[PDB]
């Protein structure tokens, strides 16, 4: 049955600029006059939004930078001038009879300027500290591009495997992201150290910055 | 105003069933045909079966023929699938969907089907007290439970501009933990009351806490 | 592939857009399962012959006549006769088939249905003709 590689799968260009996204079905999703292929646009966390229906009927509501060309096999949905809400990810799929199918995906992330993160550190609290554990909190807010590094440092000393993170997906009004790192140690262990730190490495930053506390403060 | 409401979703061990139904409203029962599609996490869309209610067809994805089954209550508005002999690759966000023809009008808001033989377990929430300046920062840890999801708002509802959920991650012990800041002014502190609401449906787990400095 | 030229003309045939008649679409549960796979070709001669002898009679009314080019409509004749006479032949001769011919006389029933609904609009004949369409060449390809 009727399988679709999208190209690229990944994708990445600055607010304005034109987008190309291509899809090639397995074999021919057209007749002479019509061809059964649509575009669908989701964002993050969100059922998918038709955009394009038949290859090149733009839905009603749907802004006019968007369109879609192509037939037989070969479709693409081109962005004629990229927005920061464009963010998401674009899949083709096709109605040329059973089973539907859809494309693997292409993800568009926007391209912005540099913004440095803005990094808050958290003990654990008190509640938790009562039960055995305790975790370490470092905050990096709003922030491009998405590389980043994050060092944990316990009286001086480097950490590693003890600690993970997590990122937002790009903000759909301003292009950022965000980030949370979690130390984790037994309250044992963390009660046994004064100087608790985290040492943020950015393109944003000229030089990485250490927010930290000390320990009973 | 058309509307999909998928439910159902939850827990189930490996070769165990479930039955996602979805209830519809707003439009014309006959008129629309009703789907339901897939979604590993991370992965792509993966369509799984077809119901007409004019007329009594079916279609399921050959993937799904034996295990799978799609029907529905028009009396209800609403349509049901079973599904049998749950393998940990089933594990995906069912959509409700709906079309005309040929391609997607409406969907529902997802329901998340999660195969695991490990136990469900409700988190424990911690606050993240702002360190206390031009604007702070303050939150909730909302660690070690299974499955997902866990839902956080923060003042009923009411505070939205400057949140940040962040995506769950795995801990080693298998459970999910998760963090959820907000931003607020530094004179805010001590005057305005800042609280995170958790809500984890599948262990009937609510909590409001209310973070301080 | 001088089922290729019956194609051919039903594209010809068109008037109108689909893209005006967005209001009419609709799905008719085309009974593909009946076809191409598993019992590959040779033995789906009935469900095909079946197939041309629906089309046929379908775009034989006088409802069709006042749709279509009548000079196209014949060309179409000709190519449909040809095939469901080649059809026949093999039915007749040695090589579920009933369901799966009730399957295919159902779905041209809700096609039929389909127009009499719409009192066989422009738009209507357009949605029909494009599925027809479509459905033959999963049929055939």
Same mark, same amino acid.
């Given at each position: 049955?009727?399988?679709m590689t999208?190209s690229?799968?990944?994708?990445?260009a600055?607010?304005?600029?034109?987008?190309?996204?291509?899809?090639?079905?397995?074999?021919?999703?057209?007749?002479?006059?019509?061809?059964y292929?649509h575009?669908?646009?989701?964002?993050?966390?969100?059922?998918?939004?038709?955009?394009?229906?038949?290859?090149?009927? &733009?839905? /009603? @509501?749907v802004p006019?930078?968007?369109?879609?060309?192509?037939?037989?096999? +070969?479709? !693409?949905?081109?962005? *004629? #001038?990229?927005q920061?809400?464009?963010?998401?990810?674009?899949?083709?799929?096709?109605?040329?009879?059973?089973?539907?199918?859809?494309?693997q995906?292409?993800?568009?992330?926007?391209?912005?300027?540099?913004?440095?993160?803005?990094?808050?550190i958290?003990?654990?609290?008190?509640?938790?500290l009562?039960?055995?554990?305790?975790?370490?909190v470092?905050?990096?807010?709003?922030?491009?591009?998405?590389?980043?590094?994050?060092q944990?440092?316990?009286?001086?000393? &480097?950490? /590693? @495997?003890?600690?993970?993170?997590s990122?937002?997906?790009?903000?759909?009004? +301003?292009s !950022?992201?965000?980030? *949370? #790192?979690?130390?984790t140690?037994?309250?044992?262990?963390?009660?046994?150290?004064?100087?608790?730190?985290?040492?943020?490495?950015?393109?944003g930053?000229?030089?990485?910055?250490?927010?930290?506390?000390?320990?009973?403060? | 105003?058309?509307?999909?409401?998928?439910?159902?979703?939850?827990?189930?061990?490996?070769?165990?069933?479930?039955?996602?139904?979805?209830?519809?409203?707003?439009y014309?029962?006959?008129?629309?045909?009703?789907?339901?599609?897939?979604?590993?996490?991370?992965?792509?869309?993966?369509?799984?079966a077809?119901?007409?209610?004019?007329?009594?067809?079916?279609?399921?994805?050959?993937?799904?023929?034996?295990?799978?089954?799609?029907?529905?209550?028009?009396?209800?508005?609403?349509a049901?699938?079973?599904?049998?002999?749950?393998?940990?690759?089933d594990?995906?966000?069912?959509?409700?969907?709906?079309?005309?023809?040929?391609?997607?009008?409406?969907?529902?808001?997802?329901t998340?089907?999660?195969?695991?033989?490990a136990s469900t377990?409700?988190?424990?929430?911690?606050?993240?007290?702002?360190?206390?300046?031009?604007?702070?920062?303050?939150?909730?840890?909302?660690?070690?439970?299974?499955?997902?999801?866990?839902?956080?708002?923060?003042?009923?509802?009411?505070?939205?501009?400057?949140?940040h959920?962040?995506?769950?991650?795995?801990?080693?012990?298998?459970?999910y933990?998760?963090?959820?800041?907000?931003?607020?002014?530094?004179?805010?502190?001590?005057?305005?009351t800042?609280?995170?609401?958790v809500?984890?449906?599948?262990?009937?787990?609510?909590?409001?806490?209310?973070?301080?400095? | 592939?001088?089922?290729?030229?019956?194609?051919?003309?039903?594209?010809?045939?068109?008037?109108?857009?689909?893209?005006?008649?967005?209001?009419?679409?609709?799905?008719?549960?085309?009974?593909?399962?009946?076809?191409?796979?598993?019992?590959?070709?040779?033995?789906?001669?009935?469900?095909?012959?079946?197939?041309?002898?629906?089309?046929?009679?379908?775009?034989?009314?006088?409802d069709?006549?006042?749709?279509?080019?009548?000079?196209?409509?014949?060309?179409?004749?000709?190519?449909?006769?040809?095939?469901?006479?080649?059809?026949?032949?093999?039915?007749?001769?040695?090589?579920?088939?009933?369901?799966?011919?009730?399957?295919?006389r159902?779905?041209?029933?809700?096609?039929?249905?389909?127009?009499?609904?719409?009192?066989?609009?422009?738009?209507?004949?357009?949605?029909?003709?494009a599925?027809?369409?479509?459905?033959?060449?999963?049929?055939?390809?």
């Amino acid at each position: 049955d009727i399988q679709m590689t999208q190209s690229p799968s990944s994708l990445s260009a600055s607010v304005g600029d034109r987008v190309t996204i291509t899809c090639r079905a397995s074999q021919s999703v057209s007749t002479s006059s019509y061809s059964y292929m649509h575009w669908y646009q989701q964002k993050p966390g969100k059922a998918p939004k038709v955009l394009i229906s038949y290859a090149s009927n &733009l839905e /009603s @509501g749907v802004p006019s930078r968007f369109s879609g060309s192509g037939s037989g096999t +070969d479709f !693409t949905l081109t962005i *004629s #001038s990229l927005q920061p809400e464009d963010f998401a990810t674009y899949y083709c799929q096709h109605s040329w009879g059973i089973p539907r199918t859809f494309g693997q995906g292409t993800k568009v992330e926007i391209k912005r300027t540099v913004a440095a993160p803005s990094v808050f550190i958290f003990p654990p609290s008190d509640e938790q500290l009562k039960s055995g554990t305790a975790s370490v909190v470092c905050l990096l807010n709003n922030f491009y591009p998405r590389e980043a590094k994050v060092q944990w440092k316990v009286d001086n000393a &480097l950490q /590693s @495997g003890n600690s993970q993170e997590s990122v937002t997906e790009q903000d759909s009004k +301003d292009s !950022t992201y965000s980030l *949370s #790192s979690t130390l984790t140690l037994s309250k044992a262990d963390y009660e046994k150290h004064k100087v608790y730190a985290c040492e943020v490495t950015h393109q944003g930053l000229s030089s990485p910055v250490t927010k930290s506390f000390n320990r009973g403060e | 105003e058309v509307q999909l409401v998928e439910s159902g979703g939850g827990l189930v061990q490996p070769g165990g069933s479930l039955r996602l139904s979805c209830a519809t409203s707003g439009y014309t029962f006959t008129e629309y045909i009703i789907h339901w599609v897939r979604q590993a996490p991370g992965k792509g869309l993966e369509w799984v079966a077809s119901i007409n209610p004019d007329y009594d067809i079916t279609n399921y994805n050959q993937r799904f023929k034996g295990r799978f089954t799609i029907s529905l209550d028009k009396s209800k508005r609403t349509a049901y699938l079973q599904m049998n002999s749950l393998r940990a690759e089933d594990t995906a966000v069912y959509y409700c969907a709906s079309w005309i023809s040929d391609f997607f009008d409406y969907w529902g808001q997802g329901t998340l089907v999660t195969v695991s033989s490990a136990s469900t377990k409700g988190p424990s929430v911690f606050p993240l007290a702002p360190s206390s300046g031009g604007t702070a920062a303050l939150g909730c840890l909302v660690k070690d439970y299974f499955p997902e999801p866990v839902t956080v708002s923060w003042n009923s509802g009411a505070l939205t501009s400057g949140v940040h959920t962040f995506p769950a991650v795995l801990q080693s012990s298998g459970l999910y933990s998760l963090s959820s800041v907000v931003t607020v002014p530094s004179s805010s502190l001590g005057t305005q009351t800042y609280i995170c609401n958790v809500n984890h449906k599948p262990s009937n787990t609510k909590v409001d806490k209310k973070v301080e400095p | 592939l001088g089922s290729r030229r019956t194609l051919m003309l039903l594209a010809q045939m068109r008037k109108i857009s689909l893209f005006s008649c967005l209001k009419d679409r609709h799905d008719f549960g085309f009974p593909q399962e009946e076809f191409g796979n598993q019992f590959q070709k040779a033995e789906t001669i009935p469900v095909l012959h079946e197939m041309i002898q629906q089309i046929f009679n379908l775009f034989s009314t006088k409802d069709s006549s006042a749709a279509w080019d009548e000079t196209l409509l014949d060309k179409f004749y000709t190519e449909l006769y040809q095939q469901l006479n080649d059809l026949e032949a093999c039915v007749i001769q040695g090589v579920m088939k009933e369901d799966s011919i009730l399957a295919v006389r159902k779905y041209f029933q809700r096609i039929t249905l389909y127009l009499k609904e719409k009192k066989y609009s422009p738009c209507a004949w357009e949605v029909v003709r494009a599925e027809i369409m479509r459905s033959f060449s999963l049929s055939t390809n």
